[PDB]
Amino acid sequence: SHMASMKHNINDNTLEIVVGDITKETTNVIVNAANGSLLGGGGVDGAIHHAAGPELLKACQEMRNNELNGEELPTGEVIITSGFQLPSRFIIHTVGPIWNQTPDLQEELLANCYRNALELVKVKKLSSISFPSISTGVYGYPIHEAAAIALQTIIQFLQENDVGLVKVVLFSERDYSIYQEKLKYLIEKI
Ligand SMILES: Nc1ncnc2c1ncn2[C@@H]1O[C@H](COP(=O)(O)OP(=O)(O)O)[C@@H](O)[C@H]1O
């Protein structure tokens, strides 16, 4: 099947948007739009658990019990695990905002997912990362607004930092089309 894609170079970095299944990406890191409980759900988190195999859930729950001391992973924060059966080396787990639960903070919190994940890529001297459309499925964040926040945040980070390749993997042509129109718009302002 055809997979729409476009790329833009930002200094020595490359930002790519693509249609695809994030579990098939061979980037160093893939990002899971995780649940706060770090339990496996449906959606992209469910896909990632199914593709990674049963060691993922076990790893995440060990991390919940130890470094998080039974607390939920806070919105906009990150943890990192191995990739297990995924073709990536690592999975960065992040929790996006649930749409309009916290209206005053949710733009910042969504941005935090991207910023915190990208800083962690830098810290570990990894050079490629794939993001899904965080919060625009069951979490209900309007795709038109989320895409703006995701892209602005990524573009800003890549303007100030050497990372390598950042991919956003969209699961539908509609989401890709929105991302494409937003990315083209933001490129024009640079
Ligand atoms: N295998 C997959 N690869 C990439 N994206 C996916 C996959 N499965 C679902 N998605 C997309 O991930 C986005 C977030 O959906 P969801 O998993 O419900 O996350 P959230 O709970 O953060 O909204 C949605 O656009 C959904 O279509």
JSON list of C-alpha atoms and ligand atoms in Angstrom, two decimals:
[
{"chain": "A", "resi": 1, "resn": "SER", "atom": "CA", "xyz": [0.00, 0.00, 0.00]},
{"chain": "A", "resi": 2, "resn": "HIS", "atom": "CA", "xyz": [1.02, 3.64, -0.51]},
{"chain": "A", "resi": 3, "resn": "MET", "atom": "CA", "xyz": [2.42, 5.52, 2.49]},
{"chain": "A", "resi": 4, "resn": "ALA", "atom": "CA", "xyz": [2.36, 9.32, 2.16]},
{"chain": "A", "resi": 5, "resn": "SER", "atom": "CA", "xyz": [5.48, 11.06, 3.48]},
{"chain": "A", "resi": 6, "resn": "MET", "atom": "CA", "xyz": [7.26, 14.43, 3.51]},
{"chain": "A", "resi": 7, "resn": "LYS", "atom": "CA", "xyz": [10.55, 15.62, 5.01]},
{"chain": "A", "resi": 8, "resn": "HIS", "atom": "CA", "xyz": [12.14, 18.91, 6.02]},
{"chain": "A", "resi": 9, "resn": "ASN", "atom": "CA", "xyz": [15.71, 19.59, 7.08]},
{"chain": "A", "resi": 10, "resn": "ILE", "atom": "CA", "xyz": [16.18, 21.83, 10.14]},
{"chain": "A", "resi": 11, "resn": "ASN", "atom": "CA", "xyz": [19.90, 22.54, 10.45]},
{"chain": "A", "resi": 12, "resn": "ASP", "atom": "CA", "xyz": [21.55, 19.06, 10.58]},
{"chain": "A", "resi": 13, "resn": "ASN", "atom": "CA", "xyz": [18.22, 17.47, 11.67]},
{"chain": "A", "resi": 14, "resn": "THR", "atom": "CA", "xyz": [15.42, 16.03, 9.54]},
{"chain": "A", "resi": 15, "resn": "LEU", "atom": "CA", "xyz": [11.72, 16.14, 10.44]},
{"chain": "A", "resi": 16, "resn": "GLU", "atom": "CA", "xyz": [9.60, 13.54, 8.61]},
{"chain": "A", "resi": 17, "resn": "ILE", "atom": "CA", "xyz": [5.87, 12.95, 8.64]},
{"chain": "A", "resi": 18, "resn": "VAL", "atom": "CA", "xyz": [4.61, 9.60, 7.41]},
{"chain": "A", "resi": 19, "resn": "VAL", "atom": "CA", "xyz": [1.59, 7.32, 7.26]},
{"chain": "A", "resi": 20, "resn": "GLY", "atom": "CA", "xyz": [2.36, 4.05, 8.98]},
{"chain": "A", "resi": 21, "resn": "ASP", "atom": "CA", "xyz": [2.35, 1.65, 11.89]},
{"chain": "A", "resi": 22, "resn": "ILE", "atom": "CA", "xyz": [4.75, 2.94, 14.55]},
{"chain": "A", "resi": 23, "resn": "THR", "atom": "CA", "xyz": [5.50, -0.64, 15.75]},
{"chain": "A", "resi": 24, "resn": "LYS", "atom": "CA", "xyz": [7.27, -1.27, 12.40]},
{"chain": "A", "resi": 25, "resn": "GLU", "atom": "CA", "xyz": [9.61, 1.76, 12.64]},
{"chain": "A", "resi": 26, "resn": "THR", "atom": "CA", "xyz": [13.35, 1.03, 12.81]},
{"chain": "A", "resi": 27, "resn": "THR", "atom": "CA", "xyz": [14.26, 4.32, 14.57]},
{"chain": "A", "resi": 28, "resn": "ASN", "atom": "CA", "xyz": [16.45, 4.12, 17.70]},
{"chain": "A", "resi": 29, "resn": "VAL", "atom": "CA", "xyz": [13.44, 5.11, 19.83]},
{"chain": "A", "resi": 30, "resn": "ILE", "atom": "CA", "xyz": [9.67, 4.82, 19.47]},
{"chain": "A", "resi": 31, "resn": "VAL", "atom": "CA", "xyz": [7.33, 6.80, 21.69]},
{"chain": "A", "resi": 32, "resn": "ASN", "atom": "CA", "xyz": [4.32, 5.17, 23.31]},
{"chain": "A", "resi": 33, "resn": "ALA", "atom": "CA", "xyz": [1.27, 7.34, 24.12]},
{"chain": "A", "resi": 34, "resn": "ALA", "atom": "CA", "xyz": [0.95, 5.40, 27.36]},
{"chain": "A", "resi": 35, "resn": "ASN", "atom": "CA", "xyz": [-1.72, 5.21, 30.04]},
{"chain": "A", "resi": 36, "resn": "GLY", "atom": "CA", "xyz": [-0.88, 6.77, 33.42]},
{"chain": "A", "resi": 37, "resn": "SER", "atom": "CA", "xyz": [-1.27, 3.34, 35.08]},
{"chain": "A", "resi": 38, "resn": "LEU", "atom": "CA", "xyz": [1.36, 1.94, 32.68]},
{"chain": "A", "resi": 39, "resn": "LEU", "atom": "CA", "xyz": [-1.10, -0.89, 32.04]},
{"chain": "A", "resi": 40, "resn": "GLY", "atom": "CA", "xyz": [-1.63, -2.02, 28.45]},
{"chain": "A", "resi": 41, "resn": "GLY", "atom": "CA", "xyz": [-4.69, -0.62, 26.66]},
{"chain": "A", "resi": 42, "resn": "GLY", "atom": "CA", "xyz": [-5.99, -0.48, 23.12]},
{"chain": "A", "resi": 43, "resn": "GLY", "atom": "CA", "xyz": [-4.90, 1.98, 20.45]},
{"chain": "A", "resi": 44, "resn": "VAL", "atom": "CA", "xyz": [-1.23, 2.66, 19.81]},
{"chain": "A", "resi": 45, "resn": "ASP", "atom": "CA", "xyz": [-0.33, 1.54, 23.36]},
{"chain": "A", "resi": 46, "resn": "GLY", "atom": "CA", "xyz": [-2.11, -1.77, 22.67]},
{"chain": "A", "resi": 47, "resn": "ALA", "atom": "CA", "xyz": [-0.32, -2.12, 19.33]},
{"chain": "A", "resi": 48, "resn": "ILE", "atom": "CA", "xyz": [3.06, -1.46, 20.98]},
{"chain": "A", "resi": 49, "resn": "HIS", "atom": "CA", "xyz": [2.40, -4.02, 23.75]},
{"chain": "A", "resi": 50, "resn": "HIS", "atom": "CA", "xyz": [1.31, -6.65, 21.20]},
{"chain": "A", "resi": 51, "resn": "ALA", "atom": "CA", "xyz": [4.38, -6.01, 18.98]},
{"chain": "A", "resi": 52, "resn": "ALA", "atom": "CA", "xyz": [6.89, -5.70, 21.88]},
{"chain": "A", "resi": 53, "resn": "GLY", "atom": "CA", "xyz": [5.68, -8.95, 23.56]},
{"chain": "A", "resi": 54, "resn": "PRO", "atom": "CA", "xyz": [4.81, -9.66, 27.25]},
{"chain": "A", "resi": 55, "resn": "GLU", "atom": "CA", "xyz": [8.17, -8.43, 28.69]},
{"chain": "A", "resi": 56, "resn": "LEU", "atom": "CA", "xyz": [7.10, -4.79, 28.11]},
{"chain": "A", "resi": 57, "resn": "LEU", "atom": "CA", "xyz": [4.19, -4.72, 30.56]},
{"chain": "A", "resi": 58, "resn": "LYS", "atom": "CA", "xyz": [6.37, -6.52, 33.12]},
{"chain": "A", "resi": 59, "resn": "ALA", "atom": "CA", "xyz": [9.15, -3.93, 32.74]},
{"chain": "A", "resi": 60, "resn": "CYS", "atom": "CA", "xyz": [6.78, -0.99, 32.99]},
{"chain": "A", "resi": 61, "resn": "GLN", "atom": "CA", "xyz": [5.02, -2.37, 36.10]},
{"chain": "A", "resi": 62, "resn": "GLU", "atom": "CA", "xyz": [8.39, -3.00, 37.79]},
{"chain": "A", "resi": 63, "resn": "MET", "atom": "CA", "xyz": [9.21, 0.66, 37.11]},
{"chain": "A", "resi": 64, "resn": "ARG", "atom": "CA", "xyz": [5.84, 1.73, 38.46]},
{"chain": "A", "resi": 65, "resn": "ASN", "atom": "CA", "xyz": [6.44, -0.26, 41.68]},
{"chain": "A", "resi": 66, "resn": "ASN", "atom": "CA", "xyz": [10.05, 0.86, 42.13]},
{"chain": "A", "resi": 67, "resn": "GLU", "atom": "CA", "xyz": [11.06, 4.27, 40.76]},
{"chain": "A", "resi": 68, "resn": "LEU", "atom": "CA", "xyz": [7.43, 5.60, 40.75]},
{"chain": "A", "resi": 69, "resn": "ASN", "atom": "CA", "xyz": [6.51, 3.91, 44.11]},
{"chain": "A", "resi": 70, "resn": "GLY", "atom": "CA", "xyz": [3.04, 2.99, 42.75]},
{"chain": "A", "resi": 71, "resn": "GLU", "atom": "CA", "xyz": [2.19, 6.48, 41.45]},
{"chain": "A", "resi": 72, "resn": "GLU", "atom": "CA", "xyz": [0.93, 7.06, 37.93]},
{"chain": "A", "resi": 73, "resn": "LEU", "atom": "CA", "xyz": [3.27, 8.40, 35.26]},
{"chain": "A", "resi": 74, "resn": "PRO", "atom": "CA", "xyz": [2.40, 12.15, 35.33]},
{"chain": "A", "resi": 75, "resn": "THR", "atom": "CA", "xyz": [1.00, 13.88, 32.25]},
{"chain": "A", "resi": 76, "resn": "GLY", "atom": "CA", "xyz": [3.79, 15.16, 30.02]},
{"chain": "A", "resi": 77, "resn": "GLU", "atom": "CA", "xyz": [6.52, 13.18, 31.78]},
{"chain": "A", "resi": 78, "resn": "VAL", "atom": "CA", "xyz": [8.53, 10.25, 30.40]},
{"chain": "A", "resi": 79, "resn": "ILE", "atom": "CA", "xyz": [10.10, 6.92, 31.30]},
{"chain": "A", "resi": 80, "resn": "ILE", "atom": "CA", "xyz": [12.25, 4.71, 29.08]},
{"chain": "A", "resi": 81, "resn": "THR", "atom": "CA", "xyz": [12.33, 0.94, 28.58]},
{"chain": "A", "resi": 82, "resn": "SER", "atom": "CA", "xyz": [13.96, -1.38, 26.10]},
{"chain": "A", "resi": 83, "resn": "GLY", "atom": "CA", "xyz": [12.28, -2.06, 22.81]},
{"chain": "A", "resi": 84, "resn": "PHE", "atom": "CA", "xyz": [11.94, -5.81, 23.48]},
{"chain": "A", "resi": 85, "resn": "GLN", "atom": "CA", "xyz": [10.45, -7.38, 20.24]},
{"chain": "A", "resi": 86, "resn": "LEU", "atom": "CA", "xyz": [10.05, -3.97, 18.53]},
{"chain": "A", "resi": 87, "resn": "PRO", "atom": "CA", "xyz": [12.65, -3.14, 15.86]},
{"chain": "A", "resi": 88, "resn": "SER", "atom": "CA", "xyz": [13.65, -0.09, 18.02]},
{"chain": "A", "resi": 89, "resn": "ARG", "atom": "CA", "xyz": [16.29, -0.09, 20.77]},
{"chain": "A", "resi": 90, "resn": "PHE", "atom": "CA", "xyz": [14.09, 1.83, 23.29]},
{"chain": "A", "resi": 91, "resn": "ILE", "atom": "CA", "xyz": [10.50, 2.85, 23.94]},
{"chain": "A", "resi": 92, "resn": "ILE", "atom": "CA", "xyz": [9.89, 6.22, 25.58]},
{"chain": "A", "resi": 93, "resn": "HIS", "atom": "CA", "xyz": [6.55, 6.09, 27.40]},
{"chain": "A", "resi": 94, "resn": "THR", "atom": "CA", "xyz": [4.68, 9.34, 27.90]},
{"chain": "A", "resi": 95, "resn": "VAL", "atom": "CA", "xyz": [1.20, 10.30, 28.99]},
{"chain": "A", "resi": 96, "resn": "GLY", "atom": "CA", "xyz": [-0.56, 12.99, 26.99]},
{"chain": "A", "resi": 97, "resn": "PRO", "atom": "CA", "xyz": [-3.30, 15.20, 28.38]},
{"chain": "A", "resi": 98, "resn": "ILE", "atom": "CA", "xyz": [-6.93, 14.04, 28.36]},
{"chain": "A", "resi": 99, "resn": "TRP", "atom": "CA", "xyz": [-8.71, 16.79, 26.37]},
{"chain": "A", "resi": 100, "resn": "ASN", "atom": "CA", "xyz": [-10.14, 19.58, 28.62]},
{"chain": "A", "resi": 101, "resn": "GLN", "atom": "CA", "xyz": [-9.46, 17.82, 31.97]},
{"chain": "A", "resi": 102, "resn": "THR", "atom": "CA", "xyz": [-7.02, 20.69, 32.66]},
{"chain": "A", "resi": 103, "resn": "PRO", "atom": "CA", "xyz": [-7.71, 23.38, 29.98]},
{"chain": "A", "resi": 104, "resn": "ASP", "atom": "CA", "xyz": [-5.22, 25.99, 31.33]},
{"chain": "A", "resi": 105, "resn": "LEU", "atom": "CA", "xyz": [-2.23, 23.60, 31.33]},
{"chain": "A", "resi": 106, "resn": "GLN", "atom": "CA", "xyz": [-2.97, 21.08, 28.54]},
{"chain": "A", "resi": 107, "resn": "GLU", "atom": "CA", "xyz": [-1.11, 22.88, 25.69]},
{"chain": "A", "resi": 108, "resn": "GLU", "atom": "CA", "xyz": [2.02, 23.03, 27.88]},
{"chain": "A", "resi": 109, "resn": "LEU", "atom": "CA", "xyz": [1.56, 19.42, 29.06]},
{"chain": "A", "resi": 110, "resn": "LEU", "atom": "CA", "xyz": [1.22, 18.08, 25.52]},
{"chain": "A", "resi": 111, "resn": "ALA", "atom": "CA", "xyz": [4.34, 20.06, 24.51]},
{"chain": "A", "resi": 112, "resn": "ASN", "atom": "CA", "xyz": [6.14, 18.51, 27.52]},
{"chain": "A", "resi": 113, "resn": "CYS", "atom": "CA", "xyz": [5.68, 15.01, 26.05]},
{"chain": "A", "resi": 114, "resn": "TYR", "atom": "CA", "xyz": [7.64, 16.00, 22.96]},
{"chain": "A", "resi": 115, "resn": "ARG", "atom": "CA", "xyz": [10.27, 18.15, 24.75]},
{"chain": "A", "resi": 116, "resn": "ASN", "atom": "CA", "xyz": [10.97, 15.58, 27.48]},
{"chain": "A", "resi": 117, "resn": "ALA", "atom": "CA", "xyz": [11.21, 12.73, 24.96]},
{"chain": "A", "resi": 118, "resn": "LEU", "atom": "CA", "xyz": [13.59, 14.75, 22.72]},
{"chain": "A", "resi": 119, "resn": "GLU", "atom": "CA", "xyz": [15.84, 15.74, 25.66]},
{"chain": "A", "resi": 120, "resn": "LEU", "atom": "CA", "xyz": [16.06, 12.07, 26.65]},
{"chain": "A", "resi": 121, "resn": "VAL", "atom": "CA", "xyz": [17.08, 11.19, 23.04]},
{"chain": "A", "resi": 122, "resn": "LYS", "atom": "CA", "xyz": [19.86, 13.82, 23.39]},
{"chain": "A", "resi": 123, "resn": "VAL", "atom": "CA", "xyz": [21.02, 12.62, 26.82]},
{"chain": "A", "resi": 124, "resn": "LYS", "atom": "CA", "xyz": [21.38, 9.03, 25.58]},
{"chain": "A", "resi": 125, "resn": "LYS", "atom": "CA", "xyz": [23.14, 10.14, 22.31]},
{"chain": "A", "resi": 126, "resn": "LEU", "atom": "CA", "xyz": [20.48, 8.45, 20.23]},
{"chain": "A", "resi": 127, "resn": "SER", "atom": "CA", "xyz": [19.89, 9.90, 16.80]},
{"chain": "A", "resi": 128, "resn": "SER", "atom": "CA", "xyz": [16.40, 8.86, 15.68]},
{"chain": "A", "resi": 129, "resn": "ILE", "atom": "CA", "xyz": [12.92, 8.86, 17.23]},
{"chain": "A", "resi": 130, "resn": "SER", "atom": "CA", "xyz": [9.35, 8.20, 16.09]},
{"chain": "A", "resi": 131, "resn": "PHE", "atom": "CA", "xyz": [6.27, 9.80, 17.69]},
{"chain": "A", "resi": 132, "resn": "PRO", "atom": "CA", "xyz": [2.62, 8.85, 17.25]},
{"chain": "A", "resi": 133, "resn": "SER", "atom": "CA", "xyz": [-0.25, 11.40, 17.38]},
{"chain": "A", "resi": 134, "resn": "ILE", "atom": "CA", "xyz": [-0.25, 11.71, 21.22]},
{"chain": "A", "resi": 135, "resn": "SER", "atom": "CA", "xyz": [-3.71, 12.37, 22.84]},
{"chain": "A", "resi": 136, "resn": "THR", "atom": "CA", "xyz": [-5.82, 12.53, 19.59]},
{"chain": "A", "resi": 137, "resn": "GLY", "atom": "CA", "xyz": [-7.45, 9.09, 19.93]},
{"chain": "A", "resi": 138, "resn": "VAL", "atom": "CA", "xyz": [-9.39, 8.10, 23.04]},
{"chain": "A", "resi": 139, "resn": "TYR", "atom": "CA", "xyz": [-7.85, 11.09, 24.94]},
{"chain": "A", "resi": 140, "resn": "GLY", "atom": "CA", "xyz": [-9.88, 13.34, 22.63]},
{"chain": "A", "resi": 141, "resn": "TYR", "atom": "CA", "xyz": [-7.42, 16.17, 21.80]},
{"chain": "A", "resi": 142, "resn": "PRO", "atom": "CA", "xyz": [-8.52, 17.84, 18.53]},
{"chain": "A", "resi": 143, "resn": "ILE", "atom": "CA", "xyz": [-6.02, 16.79, 15.84]},
{"chain": "A", "resi": 144, "resn": "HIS", "atom": "CA", "xyz": [-5.89, 20.32, 14.29]},
{"chain": "A", "resi": 145, "resn": "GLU", "atom": "CA", "xyz": [-4.68, 21.80, 17.61]},
{"chain": "A", "resi": 146, "resn": "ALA", "atom": "CA", "xyz": [-2.53, 18.82, 18.69]},
{"chain": "A", "resi": 147, "resn": "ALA", "atom": "CA", "xyz": [-0.67, 18.75, 15.34]},
{"chain": "A", "resi": 148, "resn": "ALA", "atom": "CA", "xyz": [0.16, 22.45, 15.74]},
{"chain": "A", "resi": 149, "resn": "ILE", "atom": "CA", "xyz": [1.54, 21.89, 19.26]},
{"chain": "A", "resi": 150, "resn": "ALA", "atom": "CA", "xyz": [3.46, 18.74, 18.26]},
{"chain": "A", "resi": 151, "resn": "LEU", "atom": "CA", "xyz": [5.07, 20.30, 15.21]},
{"chain": "A", "resi": 152, "resn": "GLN", "atom": "CA", "xyz": [5.85, 23.72, 16.78]},
{"chain": "A", "resi": 153, "resn": "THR", "atom": "CA", "xyz": [7.48, 21.96, 19.75]},
{"chain": "A", "resi": 154, "resn": "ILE", "atom": "CA", "xyz": [9.54, 19.59, 17.58]},
{"chain": "A", "resi": 155, "resn": "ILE", "atom": "CA", "xyz": [10.60, 22.35, 15.12]},
{"chain": "A", "resi": 156, "resn": "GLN", "atom": "CA", "xyz": [11.66, 24.63, 18.01]},
{"chain": "A", "resi": 157, "resn": "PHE", "atom": "CA", "xyz": [13.68, 21.82, 19.60]},
{"chain": "A", "resi": 158, "resn": "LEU", "atom": "CA", "xyz": [15.42, 20.92, 16.32]},
{"chain": "A", "resi": 159, "resn": "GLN", "atom": "CA", "xyz": [16.24, 24.62, 15.67]},
{"chain": "A", "resi": 160, "resn": "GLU", "atom": "CA", "xyz": [18.09, 24.77, 19.03]},
{"chain": "A", "resi": 161, "resn": "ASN", "atom": "CA", "xyz": [19.47, 21.18, 19.27]},
{"chain": "A", "resi": 162, "resn": "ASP", "atom": "CA", "xyz": [21.31, 18.55, 17.26]},
{"chain": "A", "resi": 163, "resn": "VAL", "atom": "CA", "xyz": [19.19, 15.38, 17.43]},
{"chain": "A", "resi": 164, "resn": "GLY", "atom": "CA", "xyz": [19.17, 13.62, 14.02]},
{"chain": "A", "resi": 165, "resn": "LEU", "atom": "CA", "xyz": [15.88, 12.22, 12.60]},
{"chain": "A", "resi": 166, "resn": "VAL", "atom": "CA", "xyz": [12.43, 12.89, 14.11]},
{"chain": "A", "resi": 167, "resn": "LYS", "atom": "CA", "xyz": [9.48, 11.06, 12.55]},
{"chain": "A", "resi": 168, "resn": "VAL", "atom": "CA", "xyz": [5.79, 11.57, 13.29]},
{"chain": "A", "resi": 169, "resn": "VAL", "atom": "CA", "xyz": [3.89, 8.41, 12.29]},
{"chain": "A", "resi": 170, "resn": "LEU", "atom": "CA", "xyz": [0.20, 9.05, 11.52]},
{"chain": "A", "resi": 171, "resn": "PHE", "atom": "CA", "xyz": [-2.23, 6.13, 11.45]},
{"chain": "A", "resi": 172, "resn": "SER", "atom": "CA", "xyz": [-4.74, 7.54, 8.93]},
{"chain": "A", "resi": 173, "resn": "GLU", "atom": "CA", "xyz": [-4.58, 9.56, 5.75]},
{"chain": "A", "resi": 174, "resn": "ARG", "atom": "CA", "xyz": [-6.81, 12.18, 7.39]},
{"chain": "A", "resi": 175, "resn": "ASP", "atom": "CA", "xyz": [-4.35, 12.71, 10.27]},
{"chain": "A", "resi": 176, "resn": "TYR", "atom": "CA", "xyz": [-1.42, 12.76, 7.84]},
{"chain": "A", "resi": 177, "resn": "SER", "atom": "CA", "xyz": [-3.23, 15.33, 5.66]},
{"chain": "A", "resi": 178, "resn": "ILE", "atom": "CA", "xyz": [-3.76, 17.62, 8.68]},
{"chain": "A", "resi": 179, "resn": "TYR", "atom": "CA", "xyz": [-0.09, 17.22, 9.71]},
{"chain": "A", "resi": 180, "resn": "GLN", "atom": "CA", "xyz": [1.04, 17.96, 6.13]},
{"chain": "A", "resi": 181, "resn": "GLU", "atom": "CA", "xyz": [-0.99, 21.19, 5.92]},
{"chain": "A", "resi": 182, "resn": "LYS", "atom": "CA", "xyz": [0.24, 22.30, 9.36]},
{"chain": "A", "resi": 183, "resn": "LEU", "atom": "CA", "xyz": [3.90, 21.42, 8.63]},
{"chain": "A", "resi": 184, "resn": "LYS", "atom": "CA", "xyz": [3.83, 23.28, 5.29]},
{"chain": "A", "resi": 185, "resn": "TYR", "atom": "CA", "xyz": [2.32, 26.28, 7.10]},
{"chain": "A", "resi": 186, "resn": "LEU", "atom": "CA", "xyz": [4.98, 26.24, 9.85]},
{"chain": "A", "resi": 187, "resn": "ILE", "atom": "CA", "xyz": [7.85, 25.79, 7.35]},
{"chain": "A", "resi": 188, "resn": "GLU", "atom": "CA", "xyz": [6.71, 28.98, 5.61]},
{"chain": "A", "resi": 189, "resn": "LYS", "atom": "CA", "xyz": [7.12, 31.03, 8.86]},
{"chain": "A", "resi": 190, "resn": "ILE", "atom": "CA", "xyz": [10.71, 29.79, 9.64]},
{"chain": "B", "resi": 1, "resn": "LIG", "atom": "N1", "xyz": [-0.05, 1.13, 15.27]},
{"chain": "B", "resi": 1, "resn": "LIG", "atom": "C1", "xyz": [-0.15, 2.47, 15.33]},
{"chain": "B", "resi": 1, "resn": "LIG", "atom": "N2", "xyz": [0.85, 3.27, 14.88]},
{"chain": "B", "resi": 1, "resn": "LIG", "atom": "C2", "xyz": [0.75, 4.61, 14.94]},
{"chain": "B", "resi": 1, "resn": "LIG", "atom": "N3", "xyz": [-0.31, 5.26, 15.44]},
{"chain": "B", "resi": 1, "resn": "LIG", "atom": "C3", "xyz": [-1.36, 4.57, 15.92]},
{"chain": "B", "resi": 1, "resn": "LIG", "atom": "C4", "xyz": [-1.35, 3.11, 15.89]},
{"chain": "B", "resi": 1, "resn": "LIG", "atom": "N4", "xyz": [-2.53, 2.70, 16.42]},
{"chain": "B", "resi": 1, "resn": "LIG", "atom": "C5", "xyz": [-3.24, 3.82, 16.75]},
{"chain": "B", "resi": 1, "resn": "LIG", "atom": "N5", "xyz": [-2.53, 4.92, 16.45]},
{"chain": "B", "resi": 1, "resn": "LIG", "atom": "C6", "xyz": [-2.88, 6.34, 16.63]},
{"chain": "B", "resi": 1, "resn": "LIG", "atom": "O1", "xyz": [-2.28, 6.93, 17.78]},
{"chain": "B", "resi": 1, "resn": "LIG", "atom": "C7", "xyz": [-3.04, 8.10, 18.11]},
{"chain": "B", "resi": 1, "resn": "LIG", "atom": "C8", "xyz": [-3.38, 8.21, 19.59]},
{"chain": "B", "resi": 1, "resn": "LIG", "atom": "O2", "xyz": [-4.46, 7.33, 19.86]},
{"chain": "B", "resi": 1, "resn": "LIG", "atom": "P1", "xyz": [-4.56, 6.60, 21.29]},
{"chain": "B", "resi": 1, "resn": "LIG", "atom": "O3", "xyz": [-3.68, 5.40, 21.23]},
{"chain": "B", "resi": 1, "resn": "LIG", "atom": "O4", "xyz": [-6.02, 6.46, 21.64]},
{"chain": "B", "resi": 1, "resn": "LIG", "atom": "O5", "xyz": [-3.75, 7.65, 22.20]},
{"chain": "B", "resi": 1, "resn": "LIG", "atom": "P2", "xyz": [-4.33, 8.68, 23.29]},
{"chain": "B", "resi": 1, "resn": "LIG", "atom": "O6", "xyz": [-4.95, 7.77, 24.32]},
{"chain": "B", "resi": 1, "resn": "LIG", "atom": "O7", "xyz": [-3.04, 9.33, 23.75]},
{"chain": "B", "resi": 1, "resn": "LIG", "atom": "O8", "xyz": [-5.34, 9.48, 22.51]},
{"chain": "B", "resi": 1, "resn": "LIG", "atom": "C9", "xyz": [-4.31, 8.00, 17.27]},
{"chain": "B", "resi": 1, "resn": "LIG", "atom": "O9", "xyz": [-4.19, 8.86, 16.14]},
{"chain": "B", "resi": 1, "resn": "LIG", "atom": "C10", "xyz": [-4.36, 6.57, 16.80]},
{"chain": "B", "resi": 1, "resn": "LIG", "atom": "O10", "xyz": [-5.03, 6.38, 15.55]}
]
